[PDB]
């Protein structure tokens, strides 16, 4: 029941020399397709480039009117608004900045629509995973936030949606965009403490009618699979039974594994394959997006088998010519009496 | 036990009194001598009890009219002034003369201090002097003395450090990226700006004490990087948050100098503070001594002392053991090897023996 | 001056050595006596130099075969053990005997310590003993000893304090409101929960050290209220943030005991710490001594000591000057007046001399 | 040009025994009218009770549907939403909770409409001044935020509005309701540092397109008029010339004077009369609302002459029988080199 959405030329927009984020992450991910049998058993599609009218449902119209203008030129005129939208320094400006994000969110809402008509029950669009962007500004190399648009698309057909993010960085925009609403359940497993987002603490949960409608797991350095899976599975096992939901969204950040640049965690090969697999047992409809990921080699090799675990067919460890596809899981400051404490805190918060 | 029936009353003032009264009642108003010492015909009324209690040779000597030859009168006067008052204003002229006799007369403290003096200014049963002399072999007649900032490193740099030849520079597009110019490293798992990158070889590792956060707050956190395993582990925090502070290592201990501190609950004021991190005990403390010069200082380590330069042509020596400053006279940055001051506003080695200088930007360290 | 030519080398170890060697070479391996002391026929080889350096009476005595009458042999043995080793395990039986002679022989430290002993356990030129004896006039044959929690005070209470009869309670609908039950006050200009409300009469004021914030963070801030002008001024901050810690005053100094501290960057763990705020110098420090009992402790001040109760029937004495604990044996709360332990879970005065107790909730203070 | 709006029975809704906020503050304020000549020279009006349809322009419909239900009863049923809207503990529930706020915002928008037709150029409605409330929750005894509704009313006729608050507590809702927008300039002079709002620091200014469109002045204890006026006047003198605005809103908190319960500042009689007077010189249209204020005696005596200074006629110091009407201005931790530092910081931020 796999309907895999692959953008034809997503990996054609450069991001900068020696720049952390790499739009080639998704190309090298699926570009083991020259000897990939699963594609015969998979329905491959192409995404429809989303228009500004669909994107302005949440983003302020001025933001979209701004976004469709930037280029390697046309910066001096907008230098008074470039600093009013946070673009330029952290999230830079590259060629086709209004094309890559537009097509990614188009694919995301295409999968959302496909699930909306009960056509299929699982849909993956690895070109999503931009959860940092906000209503009026961009942050964390995320200009257009696909997750929020997909959730808005599902908000009418379904009244209860999950967002599960195992990305190292906290999902702020994907949480602020529905903070006050009581319809969406956001869950993020992030490193707190003088890290990038600076938010998503243990205490910043809910707002007004959206009170308690959020879950944050602040981890630390050197987490391992033997504890990460045991601390991760019961959170969904509890939230699903306590939310009586309709559909889920699976943001799978592949920067949360070993050897990743800017990646503090250290997860094994099969340790990562517990979010894309244990989520399937719940039998609910599911979007699947991919977020940030660096160290192209490992972020792609580990990504190869995410689809396989999402479709339930084992891919032999000896991969094609297109070295091996195995990794290792240093110290672990995540004391068991600390992770257990946070797990109990989350369990007590959800029961409220 | 119960203080209302019986308890042990130990006092730290007793030592101070049994020192001060002893000092006051011998060098002045000589009394209870009971011994007469001959120093090339000079008659001394050296009291018996005080001696032998520090020099065992005098115990052996006075275990049931003396000669004590092969001793300089002035050096013996200095020795008596020590043994009686504990304070001696030593000079380089009378160093070796005060050295050999002191190792003879079982004076551990003076032995150590003259060994340190000889190792600093450049035979007996001590290793410190022998190792110090052996280390002075590069000039008896392989690595760059100091690493500037020939490479380019176009990536933006906000911190650098050395570990013996391996230039580990924090930088890149995102500062967490760590570049190695030995002859890449584990990502820094913290968002820091103006963090002090100490490199203590005694417990070989790289420490990132202090810094600023993305929320514009001062980071009182220390995280260390193990060299042999690329493990960015975390250690005990600091006592006072700082940023852009000078750092210098000395026999394991890491000294954090100056920087900026939290002022008026919202801003940063230049600080004049001394912080010590014991890379063996893993404990932090703040020394009561306060630097005369505050601001953005750069420190260098020379022998057993540390030169500090903050603002202007005034360099401030610092002996951690003696807790005293020399305050010599002459934005600069001091680099001590084989000292040398470099001017930041580039619009020259130093000799500290006579305070005489010879004449011959981002991160000089 | 310049360390490479000449400098002053002062050592704090010199006093320690001139104490330890003196102690080791008299009480054992007696040598260089030079004096013979008669104590009811007991012959003592008391060395001359050590004496007179602490007791001026022995200086006068030995300024160019002794009697020294009107002295107890055992008390003189104790005196010699002091003068030679500084450590004496005094007992209540030999207090007065060791007192009168010590004021005679110009022993300031022992004079003070026996004066403190007599003032604690209950003629000469000292005021401390005279004032202590005068203060013991309430029992030679006006104010409530301790204020419970007869009024109602329906307003919610989170902290209270006493200043001699004026029950100043933080509370109300909003905690900042301050109610006075003397025999209203300036609003507290801070949002605090579980703040320590000390009342130091020496610099008469009310201090609000420590607390929790509305953002669920620990407050390392001290703000004081001047009694005579209703001025909620602000003083120097603490060193470690705490909340719900016990507080006790002693001759100006304010001692902050235990409480909760920041654990794992998000939670609060029970703490066993000693903090001192000098209400005259306006400086804070943390004592190296750590309480054996941690948690939610309640402290009371008795004479020159502090009783602390944390969890169970074990009370922990604390002498701030001696930095030692008695650790007697027997959630409770200690209230020391004229001591008395009260059980919080109410589902009895104390005598510390023999650790014997007699038998006869929100904020007992 | 005075058009004074006085609610007939605003002071008829109790707030609780020994409770800090007192709805009688506004009654005793104008209830020196038995010998108050200025009323003959003033046009007194009555406010129209605002309907829910007008209030739901910003507040979420669920919030207003909730608000019109609470009473001394009907609490157990909403006990699951009472904690989802922050009501009950800090901001309690009293009789006519949906009447006092409704009439106050009705008067506020009545003054807004009167200024909107160029009828008059100054309008005072002391029943406003609820700037703590938020889109989905209530805070600081503020259920319905009148300022936000008035600013929304003016947002169509005028494209640039000021909000100036000299209340001790930071104005959060009046700032969050237009945080991302670039149309309204908010300015609040508050005590920061473990105080009630916990927000409005020196650094929390702007959001996205609303970047730098906010101004926060964190003061400290024991401020005096001789420095407060000198530090206060140039802020408006700069912001007006730098904003090219249309209309202003003057939130006048009378808890910012001496002897006030929960009031740390210490201001004199004529020291307070520099916001209601120096604002008039700018010649722009102005709303005038009154915020929190306690210690009924002083908060009313000092309020008596605010209207007089707003109309430019001196009222003799010997007031009627309906003791004196004079106060005093302890220590001052507001170091001049700190207030000067913050003033320079604000001046440099506004120029951006
Ligand atoms: C998903 N993801 N992957 N990588 C990142 C990411 C992206 C960016 C940064 C980052 C991580 N860590 C960082 N640390 C610093 C150090 C610093 C501390 C205190 C004050 C200033 C700077 N500055 C960063 N950028 C600045 C932000 C302000 C802007 N005006 C210029 C660019 C970033 N997110
Ligand atoms: C314009 N204006 N005038 N006065 C106020 C105002 C209003 C309220 C408070 C306040 C000031 N200061 C306060 N301090 C505390 C102490 C505290 C510290 C840390 C954790 C908890 C409490 N708790 C307050 N209320 C609680 C809030 C949580 C709720 N569950 C119960 C009620 C308030 N606003
Ligand atoms: Zn990420
Ligand atoms: Zn207020």
Author numbering:
A (entry chain D), D (entry chain B): 11 to 332, 342 to 348, 351 to 373
B (entry chain C), C (entry chain A): 29 to 92, 101 to 158, 172 to 190, 252 to 259, 286 to 319, 326 to 472, 482 to 489, 492 to 500, ...
Text lifted from the article:
Kelch repeat and BTB domain-containing protein 4 (KBTBD4) is the substrate receptor of a cullin3-dependent E3 ligase complex (CRL3KBTBD4). Recurrent indel mutations in the Kelch domain of the KBTBD4 E3 ligase rewire epigenetic programs for stemness in medulloblastoma by recruiting LSD1-CoREST-HDAC1/2 complexes as neo-substrates for ubiquitination and degradation. The mutant and drug-induced complexes adopt similar structural assemblies requiring both Kelch domains in the KBTBD4 dimer for each HDAC2 interaction.
To determine the structure of the lower affinity KBTBD4WT complex mediated by UM171, we used the BS3 crosslinker to stabilise the binding of the CoREST1NT2-HDAC2 neo-substrate. This sample yielded 2:2 and 2:1 KBTBD4WT-UM171-HDAC2 complexes at 2.9 Å and 3.1 Å, respectively. Superposition of the 2:1 and 2:2 states shows that the high structural conservation extends across the protein-compound and protein-protein interaction sites, indicating that the neo-substrate recruitment mechanism in these complexes is conserved regardless of the stoichiometry. UM171 is buried in the site 1 interfaces where it forms contacts with blades II and III from the KBTBD4WT Kelch domain, as well as with the HDAC2 catalytic pocket. The binding is further stabilised by π–π interactions between the buried UM171 pyrimidoindole core and HDAC2 residues F151 and F206. Outside of the HDAC2 catalytic pocket, UM171 forms hydrophobic interactions with KBTBD4WT I310 and P311 from the BC II loop and L356 located at the tip of the BC III loop. Site 1 superposition reveals that UM171 mimics the mutated BC II loop of KBTBD4R313PRR by engaging the same HDAC2 residues in its catalytic pocket.
